[PDB]
Design a protein around this ligand. Structure first.
Ligand SMILES: [Fe+2]
Ligand SMILES: [Fe+2]
Ligand SMILES: [Fe+2]
Ligand SMILES: [Fe+2]
Lengths: 193, 193, 192, 192
């Protein structure tokens, strides 16, 4: 399938830039008999570095030469039940500070990463700024109060987000947060898209 | 500002397609003295139908000739407090069936429409299928249980989404929902993006 | 239509953001009957400044509320004959320096602007220089020798013989004339 | 590098989806030390089928995990001389029918494929016919008269004199030869 996608896209690119199995095979340094096979679905074992070259000689990226993520939907929908949520914990010196509960995700939209974040630290100073995402983010406060921080990791703007507050964080905009001072814990839904 | 954006974009388009104030003015049927002014920021009062023509003669859309939505962010973020949420009610014969609570929205990402939907009907048959959105949707069950319906408005797939369930609805995929049978009401967060 | 296109797109945006006729009308300082009319194809007279504000309250752009360029094709294609082509003169002091021949253009791809540029100046120092555009550009030398100048007035220079082709990335400023004392040159430039 | 590019992009995707070395390793039936190595630039030998599965568990594509085409420019531009151009022959029975001259191409825009096509067939019935491509195409008649055929073998036909230009939308199938008995024609085609 990844092999079949490569086959169709290799052939198409080869054709759009006017190269016969001969030229491509030469330019790359293989036997026309080889490229032929690649286009016959036999690319399976080619390596990431080999694909690197093949894409070069064709003035393109490996991405243009490989099939799209795929379709994991059922009539346009995909459902995640709470009992099948993957869980990861942000621990520090063996103590939970955050727990990320991963919600439904789909290959038909890879930028979509929805999480339920349980914040187990109510000390604003424990907030550790993270560079910034390569995509926008939607936030929603489920429980407690959230002390949000954003901007210059050194000199940052602050906000006290009570339950029910919603926020929008532009991509590449650095941010960090804990639960409001002395309130114990908080809960927010974060949707990176 | 909408007038200033039009000015810069009118001039740029005019130039990229090689037309002097003369040709454009003729082709459109105005005085070169007029187009000149338009490009001087004086387009303000032009009508939607006039802009329609101007964009035609330049082989483009009014969209390419008008500035982008704008920037309403504060250092890459925008915050909506719960007390400023706009509320709309889906009523039927004077009785609330749904209440939409609008969450933060931003011009820097117009496709983003997050809502908290209180479903006040627990009768699956009241589910009224809506064509489908021109964008994807992320759903999350906040309270109660949701009886989701999707696909053929006539013969549809059904799902019983307990609290904590998350769902993904591809765009143009028709859907509708009520709270699970006899449970009174439910709550879900819907994020159209 | 601009009118019908607005009508359809306005209703969708409004319904999309959970605003009823009145909510929208309130924010706009209009009456709900007015808005309803707009969604009934009567927005034709709305000005650019009004649309600007409508888009603002709907948290989007005028473009997102207006219809696409349109379609001028014919089974996926459009053809322009050498007769039906506009001609623009890049004139200085009545002295023709550049003469652009506009090739086929289409709404289905507004960004495509193909041209045959006759350069009537063989004085490299006459190279005016623009500040690049928000599009890429492909060039091909048809006749003569081209004197290419890119980067920014201060710049790399190339003498392109006939049959030469080059790619100029968006926002990269450029200028050109025909090679020193050769009189004139010709090149086709396709901005996309 | 493909290796380094993978390394950087894999780590971001993993961190992006809240998977630690072990979680990823579990789904892949690999060990956490392996994955860590990959994020350390040692993914070079991973096959296309393996990358395919890695992308699958990371709910994305191989492309989203691999680096962009790369950059071959030079201050926003790249130049090709008539000497440095590849030539491909569309041959049938040793009889040259079409000869394509490849013009300047760039990774910064892979989709751009400019060509000078010498058509050595004046027999319209020789018009082969392709099934359109996933890109748009601009054409210009350099020499001779072109016999255009579009739609699908069953089709609109146009006789393009010299200087004619046309736009062919993506997926719209086309074919062509030189006008009846005129020997040969020339046209530049730029797919983008
Ligand atoms: Fe984040
Ligand atoms: Fe919906
Ligand atoms: Fe240019
Ligand atoms: Fe073609």
């Amino acid at each position: 399938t990844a092999s079949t996608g490569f086959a169709e896209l290799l052939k198409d690119r080869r054709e759009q830039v006017k190269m016969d199995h001969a030229a491509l095979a030469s330019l790359l340094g293989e036997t026309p008999e080889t490229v032929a096979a690649w286009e016959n679905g036999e690319g399976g074992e080619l390596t990431l570095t080999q694909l690197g070259r093949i894409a070069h000689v064709l003035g393109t990226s490996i991405g243009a030469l490989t099939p799209p993520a795929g379709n994991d939907l059922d009539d346009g929908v995909i459902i995640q039940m709470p009992d099948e949520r993957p869980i990861l914990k942000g621990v520090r010196d063996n103590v939970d500070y955050y727990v990320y509960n991963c919600l439904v995700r789909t290959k038909r939209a890879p930028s979509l990463v929805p999480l339920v974040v349980d914040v187990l630290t109510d000390n604003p100073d424990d907030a550790k700024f993270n560079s910034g995402h390569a995509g926008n983010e939607f936030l929603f406060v489920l429980e407690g109060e959230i002390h949000m921080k954003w901007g210059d990791k050194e000199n940052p703007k602050e906000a006290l987000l009570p339950t029910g507050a919603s926020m929008f964080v532009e991509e590449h905009v650095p941010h960090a947060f804990t639960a409001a001072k002395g309130t114990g814990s908080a809960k927010l839904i974060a949707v990176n898209f």
